[PDB]
Short mmCIF file of C-alpha atoms in Angstrom, two decimals:
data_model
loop_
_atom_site.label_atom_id
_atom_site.label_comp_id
_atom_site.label_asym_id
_atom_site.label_seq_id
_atom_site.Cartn_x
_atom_site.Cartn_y
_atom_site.Cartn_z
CA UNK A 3 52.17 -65.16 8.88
CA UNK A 4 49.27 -64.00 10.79
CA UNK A 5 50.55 -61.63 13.57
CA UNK A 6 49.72 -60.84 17.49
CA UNK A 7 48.40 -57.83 15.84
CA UNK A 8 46.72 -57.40 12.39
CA UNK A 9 45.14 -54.54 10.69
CA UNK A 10 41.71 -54.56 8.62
CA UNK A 11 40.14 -53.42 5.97
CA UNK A 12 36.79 -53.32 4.58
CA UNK A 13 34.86 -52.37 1.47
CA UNK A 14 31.31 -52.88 1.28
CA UNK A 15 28.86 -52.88 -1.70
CA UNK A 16 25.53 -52.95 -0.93
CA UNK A 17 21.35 -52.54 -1.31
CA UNK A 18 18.80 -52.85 0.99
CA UNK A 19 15.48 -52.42 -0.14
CA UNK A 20 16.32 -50.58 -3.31
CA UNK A 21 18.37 -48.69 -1.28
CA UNK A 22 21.68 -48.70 -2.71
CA UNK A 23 25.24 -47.97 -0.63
CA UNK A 24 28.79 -48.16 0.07
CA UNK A 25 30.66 -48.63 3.36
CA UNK A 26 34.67 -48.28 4.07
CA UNK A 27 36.38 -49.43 6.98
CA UNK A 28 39.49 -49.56 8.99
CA UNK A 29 40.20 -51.47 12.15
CA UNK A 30 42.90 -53.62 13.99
CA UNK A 31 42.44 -56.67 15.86
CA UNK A 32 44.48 -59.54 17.59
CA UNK A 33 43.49 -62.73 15.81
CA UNK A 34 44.41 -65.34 18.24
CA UNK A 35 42.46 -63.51 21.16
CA UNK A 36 39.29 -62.95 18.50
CA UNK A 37 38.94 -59.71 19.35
CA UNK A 38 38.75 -56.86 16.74
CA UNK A 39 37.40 -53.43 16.44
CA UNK A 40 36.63 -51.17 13.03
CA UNK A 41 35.51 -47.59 12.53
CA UNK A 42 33.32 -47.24 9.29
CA UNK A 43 32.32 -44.66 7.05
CA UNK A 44 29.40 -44.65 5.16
CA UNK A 45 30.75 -43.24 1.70
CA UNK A 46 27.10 -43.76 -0.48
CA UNK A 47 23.65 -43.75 0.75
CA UNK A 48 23.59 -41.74 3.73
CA UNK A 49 22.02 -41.57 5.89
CA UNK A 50 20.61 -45.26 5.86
CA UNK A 51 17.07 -45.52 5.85
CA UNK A 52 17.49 -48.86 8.00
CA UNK A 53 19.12 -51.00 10.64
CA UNK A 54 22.79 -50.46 11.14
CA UNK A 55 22.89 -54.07 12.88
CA UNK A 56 21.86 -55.70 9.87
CA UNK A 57 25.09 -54.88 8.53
CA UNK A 58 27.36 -55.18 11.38
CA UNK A 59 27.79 -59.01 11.05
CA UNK A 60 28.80 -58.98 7.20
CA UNK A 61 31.83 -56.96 8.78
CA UNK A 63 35.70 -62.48 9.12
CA UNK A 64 36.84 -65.82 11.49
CA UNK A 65 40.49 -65.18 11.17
CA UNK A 66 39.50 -63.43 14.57
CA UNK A 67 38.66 -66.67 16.46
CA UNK A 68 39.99 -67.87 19.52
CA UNK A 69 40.89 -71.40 18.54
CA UNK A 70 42.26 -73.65 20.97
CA UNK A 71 45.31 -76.46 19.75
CA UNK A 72 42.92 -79.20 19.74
CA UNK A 73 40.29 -77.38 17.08
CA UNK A 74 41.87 -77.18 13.41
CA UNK A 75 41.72 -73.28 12.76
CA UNK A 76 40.00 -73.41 9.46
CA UNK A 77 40.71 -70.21 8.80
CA UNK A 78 44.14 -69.13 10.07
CA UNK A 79 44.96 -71.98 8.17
CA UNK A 80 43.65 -70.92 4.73
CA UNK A 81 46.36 -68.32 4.03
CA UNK A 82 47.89 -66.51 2.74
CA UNK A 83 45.47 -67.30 -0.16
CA UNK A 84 42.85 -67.10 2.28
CA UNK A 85 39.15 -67.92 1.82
CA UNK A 86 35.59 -66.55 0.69
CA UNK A 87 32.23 -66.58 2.54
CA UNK A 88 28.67 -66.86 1.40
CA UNK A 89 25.47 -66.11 4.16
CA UNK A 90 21.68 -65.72 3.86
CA UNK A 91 19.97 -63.73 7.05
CA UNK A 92 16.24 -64.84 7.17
CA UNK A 93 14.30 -62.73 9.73
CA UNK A 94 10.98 -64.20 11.03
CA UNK A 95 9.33 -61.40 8.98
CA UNK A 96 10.69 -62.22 5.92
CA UNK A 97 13.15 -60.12 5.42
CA UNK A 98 16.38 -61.73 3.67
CA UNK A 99 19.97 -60.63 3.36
CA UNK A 100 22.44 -62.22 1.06
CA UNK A 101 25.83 -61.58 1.50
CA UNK A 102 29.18 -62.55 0.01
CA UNK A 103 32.63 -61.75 1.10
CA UNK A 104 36.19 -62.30 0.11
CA UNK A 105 39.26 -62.27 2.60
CA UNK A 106 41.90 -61.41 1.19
CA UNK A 107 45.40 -60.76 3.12
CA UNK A 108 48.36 -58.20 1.76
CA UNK A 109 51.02 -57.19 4.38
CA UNK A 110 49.73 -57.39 7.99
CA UNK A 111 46.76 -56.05 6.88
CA UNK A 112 42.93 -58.38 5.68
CA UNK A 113 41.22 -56.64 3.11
CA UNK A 114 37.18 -58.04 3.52
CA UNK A 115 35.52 -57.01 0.45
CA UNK A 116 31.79 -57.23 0.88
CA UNK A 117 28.22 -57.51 -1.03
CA UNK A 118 25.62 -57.44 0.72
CA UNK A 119 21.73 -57.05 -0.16
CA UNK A 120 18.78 -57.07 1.88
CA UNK A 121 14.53 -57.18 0.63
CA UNK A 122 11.29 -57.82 1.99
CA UNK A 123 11.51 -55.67 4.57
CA UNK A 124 8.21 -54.61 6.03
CA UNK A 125 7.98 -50.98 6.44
CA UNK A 126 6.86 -50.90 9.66
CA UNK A 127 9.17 -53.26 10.81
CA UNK A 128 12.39 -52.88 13.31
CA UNK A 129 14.95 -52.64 10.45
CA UNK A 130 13.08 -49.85 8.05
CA UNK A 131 11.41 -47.78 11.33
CA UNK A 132 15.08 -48.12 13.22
CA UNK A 133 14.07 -49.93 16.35
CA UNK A 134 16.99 -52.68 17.05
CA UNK A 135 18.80 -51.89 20.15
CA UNK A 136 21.87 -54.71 19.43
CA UNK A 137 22.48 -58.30 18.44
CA UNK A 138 22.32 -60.53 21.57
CA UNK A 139 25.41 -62.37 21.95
CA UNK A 140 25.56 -65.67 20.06
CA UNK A 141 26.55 -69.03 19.30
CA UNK A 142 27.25 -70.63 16.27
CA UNK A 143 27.39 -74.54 15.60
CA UNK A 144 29.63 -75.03 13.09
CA UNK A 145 30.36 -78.56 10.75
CA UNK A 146 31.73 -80.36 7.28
CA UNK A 147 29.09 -80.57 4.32
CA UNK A 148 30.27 -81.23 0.88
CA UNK A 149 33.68 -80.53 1.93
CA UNK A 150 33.59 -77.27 3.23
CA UNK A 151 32.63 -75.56 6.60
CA UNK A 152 29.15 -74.48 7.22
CA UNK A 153 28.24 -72.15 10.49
CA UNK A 154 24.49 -72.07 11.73
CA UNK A 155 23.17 -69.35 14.42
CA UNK A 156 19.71 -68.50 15.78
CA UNK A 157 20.42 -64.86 15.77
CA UNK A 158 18.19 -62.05 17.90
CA UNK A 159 17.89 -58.63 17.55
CA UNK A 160 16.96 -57.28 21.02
CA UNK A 161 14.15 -54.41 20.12
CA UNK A 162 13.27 -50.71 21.74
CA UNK A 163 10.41 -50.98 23.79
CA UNK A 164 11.94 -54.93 24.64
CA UNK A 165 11.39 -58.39 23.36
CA UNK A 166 13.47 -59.83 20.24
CA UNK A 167 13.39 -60.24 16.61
CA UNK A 168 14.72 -63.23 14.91
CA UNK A 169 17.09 -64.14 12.71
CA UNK A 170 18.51 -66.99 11.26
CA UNK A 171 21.87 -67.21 9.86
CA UNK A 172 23.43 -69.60 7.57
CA UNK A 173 27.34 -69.13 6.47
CA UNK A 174 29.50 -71.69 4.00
CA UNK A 175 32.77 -70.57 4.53
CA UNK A 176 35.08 -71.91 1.41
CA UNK A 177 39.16 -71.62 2.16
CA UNK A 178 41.17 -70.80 -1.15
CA UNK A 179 43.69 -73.94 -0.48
CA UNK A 180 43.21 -77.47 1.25
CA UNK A 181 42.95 -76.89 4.90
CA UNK A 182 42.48 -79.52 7.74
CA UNK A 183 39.17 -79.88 8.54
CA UNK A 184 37.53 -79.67 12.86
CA UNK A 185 34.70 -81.85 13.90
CA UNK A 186 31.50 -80.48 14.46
CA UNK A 187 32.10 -77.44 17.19
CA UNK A 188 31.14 -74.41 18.90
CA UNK A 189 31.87 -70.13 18.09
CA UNK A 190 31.04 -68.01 20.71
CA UNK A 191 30.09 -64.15 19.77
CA UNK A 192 29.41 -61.26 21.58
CA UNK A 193 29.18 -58.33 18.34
CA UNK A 194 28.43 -53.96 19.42
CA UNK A 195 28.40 -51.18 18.87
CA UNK A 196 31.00 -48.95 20.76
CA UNK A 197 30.06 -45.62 19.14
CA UNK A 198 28.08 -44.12 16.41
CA UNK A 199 26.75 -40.34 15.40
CA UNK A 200 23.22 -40.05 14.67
CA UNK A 201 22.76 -40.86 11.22
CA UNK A 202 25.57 -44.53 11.96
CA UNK A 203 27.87 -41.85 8.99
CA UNK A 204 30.29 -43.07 11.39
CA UNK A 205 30.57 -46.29 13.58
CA UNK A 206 33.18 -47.92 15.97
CA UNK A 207 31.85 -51.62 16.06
CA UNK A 208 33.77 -54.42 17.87
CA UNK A 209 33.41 -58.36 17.76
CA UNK A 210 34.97 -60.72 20.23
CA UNK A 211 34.58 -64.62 19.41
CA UNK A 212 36.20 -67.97 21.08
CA UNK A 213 35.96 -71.46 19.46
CA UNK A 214 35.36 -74.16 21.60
CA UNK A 215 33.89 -77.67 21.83
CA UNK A 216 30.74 -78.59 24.27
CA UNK A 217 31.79 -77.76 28.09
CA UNK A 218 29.85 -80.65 29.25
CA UNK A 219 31.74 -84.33 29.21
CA UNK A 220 30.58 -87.86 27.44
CA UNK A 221 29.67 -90.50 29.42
CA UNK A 222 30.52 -92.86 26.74
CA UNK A 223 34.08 -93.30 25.16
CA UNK A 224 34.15 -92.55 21.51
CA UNK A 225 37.74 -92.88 19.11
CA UNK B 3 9.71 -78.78 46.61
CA UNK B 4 12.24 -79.77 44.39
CA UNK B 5 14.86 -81.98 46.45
CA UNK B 6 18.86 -82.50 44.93
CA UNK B 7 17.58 -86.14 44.01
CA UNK B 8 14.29 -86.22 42.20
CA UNK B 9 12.55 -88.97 39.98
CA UNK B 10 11.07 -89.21 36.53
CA UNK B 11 8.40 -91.24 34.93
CA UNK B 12 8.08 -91.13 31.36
CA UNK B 13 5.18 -92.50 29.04
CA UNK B 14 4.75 -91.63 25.55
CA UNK B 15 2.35 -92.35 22.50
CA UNK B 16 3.92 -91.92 19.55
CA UNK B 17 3.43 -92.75 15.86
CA UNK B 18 5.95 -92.14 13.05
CA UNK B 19 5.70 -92.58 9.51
CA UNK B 20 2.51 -94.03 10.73
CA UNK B 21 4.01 -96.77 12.69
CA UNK B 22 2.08 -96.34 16.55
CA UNK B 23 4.15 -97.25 19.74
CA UNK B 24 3.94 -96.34 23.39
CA UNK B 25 7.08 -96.12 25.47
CA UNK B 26 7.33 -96.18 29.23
CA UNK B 27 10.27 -95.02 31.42
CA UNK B 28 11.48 -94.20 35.04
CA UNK B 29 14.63 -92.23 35.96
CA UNK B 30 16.28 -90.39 38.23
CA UNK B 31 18.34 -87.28 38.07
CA UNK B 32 19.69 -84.02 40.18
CA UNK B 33 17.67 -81.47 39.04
CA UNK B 34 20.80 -78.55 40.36
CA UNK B 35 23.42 -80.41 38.76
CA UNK B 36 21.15 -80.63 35.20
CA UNK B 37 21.99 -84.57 35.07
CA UNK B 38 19.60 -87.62 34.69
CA UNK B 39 19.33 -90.90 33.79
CA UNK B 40 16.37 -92.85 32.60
CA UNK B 41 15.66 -96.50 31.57
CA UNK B 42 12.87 -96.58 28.40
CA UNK B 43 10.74 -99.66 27.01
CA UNK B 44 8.78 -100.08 24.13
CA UNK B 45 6.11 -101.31 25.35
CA UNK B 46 3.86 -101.91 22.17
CA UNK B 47 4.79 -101.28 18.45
CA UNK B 48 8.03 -103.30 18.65
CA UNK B 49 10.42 -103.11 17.03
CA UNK B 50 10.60 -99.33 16.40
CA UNK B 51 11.59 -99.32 12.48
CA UNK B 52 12.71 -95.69 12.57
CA UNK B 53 16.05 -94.42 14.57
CA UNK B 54 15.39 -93.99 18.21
CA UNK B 55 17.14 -90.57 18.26
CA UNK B 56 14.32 -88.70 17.04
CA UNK B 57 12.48 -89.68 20.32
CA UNK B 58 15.43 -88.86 23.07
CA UNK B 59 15.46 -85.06 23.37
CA UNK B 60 11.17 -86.11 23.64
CA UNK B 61 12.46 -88.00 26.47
CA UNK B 63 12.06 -81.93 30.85
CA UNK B 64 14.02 -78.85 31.31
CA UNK B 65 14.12 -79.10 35.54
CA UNK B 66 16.91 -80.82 35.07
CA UNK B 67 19.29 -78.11 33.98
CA UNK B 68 21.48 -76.38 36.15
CA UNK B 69 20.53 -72.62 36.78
CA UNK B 70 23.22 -69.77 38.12
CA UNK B 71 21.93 -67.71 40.87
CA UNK B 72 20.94 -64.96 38.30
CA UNK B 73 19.09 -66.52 35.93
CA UNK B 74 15.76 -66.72 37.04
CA UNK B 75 14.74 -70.73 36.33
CA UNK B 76 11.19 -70.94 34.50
CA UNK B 77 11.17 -74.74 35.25
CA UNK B 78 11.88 -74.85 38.63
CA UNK B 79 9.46 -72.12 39.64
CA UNK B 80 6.83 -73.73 37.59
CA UNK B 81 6.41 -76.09 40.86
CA UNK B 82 4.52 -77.11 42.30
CA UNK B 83 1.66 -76.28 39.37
CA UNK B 84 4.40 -77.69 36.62
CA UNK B 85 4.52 -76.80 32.97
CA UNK B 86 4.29 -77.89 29.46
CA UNK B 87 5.86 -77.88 26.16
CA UNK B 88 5.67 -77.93 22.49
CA UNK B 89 8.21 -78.25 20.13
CA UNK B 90 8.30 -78.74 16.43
CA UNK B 91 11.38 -80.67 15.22
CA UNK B 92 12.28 -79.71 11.39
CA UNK B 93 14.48 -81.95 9.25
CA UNK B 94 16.67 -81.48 6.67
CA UNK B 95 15.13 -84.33 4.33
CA UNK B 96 11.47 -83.02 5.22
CA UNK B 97 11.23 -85.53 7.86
CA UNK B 98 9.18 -83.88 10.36
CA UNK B 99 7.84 -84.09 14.22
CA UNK B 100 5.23 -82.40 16.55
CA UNK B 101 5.68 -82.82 20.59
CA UNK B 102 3.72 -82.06 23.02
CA UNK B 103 4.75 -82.85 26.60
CA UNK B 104 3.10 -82.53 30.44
CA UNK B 105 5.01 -82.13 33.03
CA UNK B 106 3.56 -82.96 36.36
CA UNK B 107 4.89 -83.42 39.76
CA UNK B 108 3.97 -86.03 42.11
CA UNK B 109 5.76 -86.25 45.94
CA UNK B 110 9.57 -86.46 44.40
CA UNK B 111 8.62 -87.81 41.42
CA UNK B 112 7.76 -85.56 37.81
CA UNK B 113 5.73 -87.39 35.19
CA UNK B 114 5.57 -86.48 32.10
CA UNK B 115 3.11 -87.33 29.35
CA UNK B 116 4.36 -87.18 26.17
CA UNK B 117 2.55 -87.39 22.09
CA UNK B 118 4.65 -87.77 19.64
CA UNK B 119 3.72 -87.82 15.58
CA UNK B 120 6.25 -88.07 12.82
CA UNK B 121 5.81 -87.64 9.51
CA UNK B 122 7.18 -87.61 5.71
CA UNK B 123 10.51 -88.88 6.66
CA UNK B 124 12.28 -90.52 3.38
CA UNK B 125 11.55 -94.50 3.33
CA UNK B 126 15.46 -94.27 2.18
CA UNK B 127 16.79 -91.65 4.75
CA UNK B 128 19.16 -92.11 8.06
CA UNK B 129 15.79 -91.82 10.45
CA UNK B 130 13.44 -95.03 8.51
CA UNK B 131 17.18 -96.62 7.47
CA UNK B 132 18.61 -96.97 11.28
CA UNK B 133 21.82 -94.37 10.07
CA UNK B 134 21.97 -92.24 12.91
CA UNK B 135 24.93 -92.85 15.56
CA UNK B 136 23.61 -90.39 17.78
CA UNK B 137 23.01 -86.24 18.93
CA UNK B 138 26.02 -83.96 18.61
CA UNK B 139 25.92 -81.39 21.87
CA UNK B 140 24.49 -78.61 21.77
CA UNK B 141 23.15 -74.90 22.27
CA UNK B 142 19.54 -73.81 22.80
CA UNK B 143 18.83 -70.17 22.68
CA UNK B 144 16.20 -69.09 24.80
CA UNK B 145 13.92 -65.78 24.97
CA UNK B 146 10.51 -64.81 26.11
CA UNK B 147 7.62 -64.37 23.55
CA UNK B 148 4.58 -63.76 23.91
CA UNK B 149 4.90 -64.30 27.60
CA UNK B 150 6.14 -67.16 27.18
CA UNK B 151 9.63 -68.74 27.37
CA UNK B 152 10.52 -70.26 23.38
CA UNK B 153 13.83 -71.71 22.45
CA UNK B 154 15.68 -72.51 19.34
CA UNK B 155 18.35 -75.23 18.32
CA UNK B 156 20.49 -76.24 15.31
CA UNK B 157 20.39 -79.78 16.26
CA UNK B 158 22.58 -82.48 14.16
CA UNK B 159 22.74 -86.32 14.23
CA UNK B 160 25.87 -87.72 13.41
CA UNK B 161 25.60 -90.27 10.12
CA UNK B 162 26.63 -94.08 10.10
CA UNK B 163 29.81 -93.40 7.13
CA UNK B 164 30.13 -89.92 8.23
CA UNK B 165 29.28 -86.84 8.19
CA UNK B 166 25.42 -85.06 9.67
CA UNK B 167 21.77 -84.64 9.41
CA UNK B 168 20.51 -81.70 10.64
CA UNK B 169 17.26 -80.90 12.20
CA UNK B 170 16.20 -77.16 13.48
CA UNK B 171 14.10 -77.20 17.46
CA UNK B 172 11.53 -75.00 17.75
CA UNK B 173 10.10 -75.19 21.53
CA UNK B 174 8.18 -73.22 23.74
CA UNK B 175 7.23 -74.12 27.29
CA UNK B 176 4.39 -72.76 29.07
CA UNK B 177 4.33 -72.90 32.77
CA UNK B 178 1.07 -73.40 34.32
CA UNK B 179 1.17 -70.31 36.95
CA UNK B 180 3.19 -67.16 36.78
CA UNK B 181 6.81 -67.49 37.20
CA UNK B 182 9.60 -64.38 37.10
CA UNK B 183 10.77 -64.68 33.24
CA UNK B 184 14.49 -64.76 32.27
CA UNK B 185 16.23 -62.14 29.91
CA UNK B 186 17.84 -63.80 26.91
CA UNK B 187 20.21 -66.77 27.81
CA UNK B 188 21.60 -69.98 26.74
CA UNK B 189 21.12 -73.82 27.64
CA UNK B 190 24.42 -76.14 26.36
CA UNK B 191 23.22 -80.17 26.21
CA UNK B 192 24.28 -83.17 25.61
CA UNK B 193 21.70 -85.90 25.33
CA UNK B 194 23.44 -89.74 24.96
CA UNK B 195 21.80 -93.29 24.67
CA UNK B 196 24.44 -95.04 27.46
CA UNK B 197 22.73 -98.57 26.59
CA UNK B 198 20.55 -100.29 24.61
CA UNK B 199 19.20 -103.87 23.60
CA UNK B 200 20.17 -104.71 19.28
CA UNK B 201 16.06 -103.62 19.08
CA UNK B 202 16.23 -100.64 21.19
CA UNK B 203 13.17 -102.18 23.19
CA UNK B 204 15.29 -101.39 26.39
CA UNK B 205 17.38 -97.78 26.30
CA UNK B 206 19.43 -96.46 29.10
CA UNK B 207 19.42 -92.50 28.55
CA UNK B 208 21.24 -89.32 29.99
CA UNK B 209 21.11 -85.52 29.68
CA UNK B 210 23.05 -83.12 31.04
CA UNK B 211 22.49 -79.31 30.70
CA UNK B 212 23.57 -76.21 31.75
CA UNK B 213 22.16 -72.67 31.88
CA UNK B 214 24.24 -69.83 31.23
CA UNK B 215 24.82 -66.14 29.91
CA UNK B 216 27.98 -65.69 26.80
CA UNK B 217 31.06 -66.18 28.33
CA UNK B 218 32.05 -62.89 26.43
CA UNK B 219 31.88 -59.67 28.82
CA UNK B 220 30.36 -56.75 27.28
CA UNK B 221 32.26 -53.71 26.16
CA UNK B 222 29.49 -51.50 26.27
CA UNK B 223 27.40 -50.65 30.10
#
């Protein structure tokens, strides 16, 4: 069902700070290496008065490394596949919302998007442009109410050095019943590969690997 | 100054929910290898009527092990030392202030800890006794304003399933100037190994690791 090889695409719907626009994408990735790269197109609201990297995340867990002895949440959810919900809350009070729906037709994921972002202080990094990249990551991941719930403590690394925080909350919700992991680990490492001036046009990549804690128990559990 | 085979002594004073007790411990641990071991007793407000898990990660960052480039704010701190401050933030509303001081004497770092609790649910998992114990974990670490802070999602795994979560806040301020690390990541995993019914007498271990993402970059 899900290939060596899989194609993407994306639609994004968004506003951030009153700023409305719309994104398009394309990309490929191999799912069971997590690895994936898009090139994307801002259609509306160019050039972006903000933060390209404050989008870059809300562009899917299909491409995950899993090893045998995780449950694959979300290879497992299709083909009717599953939906995701995620707030962003920045240390200066800046939110994003975002929802997104993965969808699968062919060998190809369509990720339709909505995404919307307030509160951002003018002269902060994501209105005055000054985010470099999103450090690499790691996201703890476990069961409440049934469905699977990812937390991060992202950073923004900043021109001119030091960090800006973020933290991330995502309930991912598959479409059918799906076996469910423990409590476990996702590994990220999200960037930019290319962009012109104005981020019109960007090549962004995402590599992530599932895994549980490398360190062993010292006391036997069932 | 810091040998592959150091010592700890612990004492804390502590009060949750406004119940006081003072704890006293002595390990051991290899400070390279980011292991230790350490034997706690209550030694006045027993029996502790709250879950001892919300006092173990209280319970010094020397003890993680360090690759060659990551500079190591800990182990530099010596022999001058370091504290720390951390806020723990519940789920429930529960909620706990830190403060530790971490000292060095011949082979032996003491550490002098305050802990306060507060506006945990008399019906929760902490006040109930619910908690089985700490999943593992990752910190994420960066400097701020010049000094080194970093964050958890912490959970405690629930009696009948299921967790609790709590978010770490810490930073640690070392007491002369020490080379400061870029960006990084500490995985733990903190585990009672023994204990009496009371918890009066806990055998405890840590281990931890230092490290950057396993993920190479695909930009220079």
């Amino acid at each position: 069902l899900i290939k060596e090889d899989m194609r993407v695409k994306v639609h994004m719907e968004g506003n951030v700070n009153g700023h409305a626009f719309v994104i398009e994408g394309e990309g490929k990735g191999k799912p069971y290496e997590g690895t994936q790269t898009a090139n994307l197109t801002v259609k509306e609201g160019a050039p972006l008065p903000f933060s390209y990297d404050i989008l870059t995340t809300a562009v899917n867990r299909v491409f995950t490394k899993y090893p045998e002895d995780i449950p694959d949440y979300f290879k497992q959810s299709f083909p009717e596949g599953y939906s995701w919900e995620r707030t962003m809350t920045f240390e200066d009070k800046g939110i994003c919302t975002i929802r997104s729906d993965i969808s699968l037709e062919g060998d190809c994921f369509f990720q339709n998007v909505r995404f919307k972002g307030t509160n951002f202080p003018p002269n902060g990094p994501v209105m005055q442009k000054k985010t470099l990249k999103w450090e690499p990551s790691t996201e703890k991941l476990h069961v409440r109410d049934g469905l699977l719930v990812g937390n991060i403590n992202m950073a923004l690394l900043l021109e001119g050095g030091g960090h800006y925080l973020c933290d991330f909350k995502t309930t991912y919700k598959a479409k059918k019943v799906v076996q469910l992991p423990d409590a476990h680990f996702v590994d990220h490492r999200i960037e930019i590969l290319g962009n012109d001036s104005d981020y019109n046009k960007v090549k962004l990549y995402e590599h992530a690997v599932a895994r549980y804690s490398p360190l062993p128990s010292q006391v036997w559990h069932h």
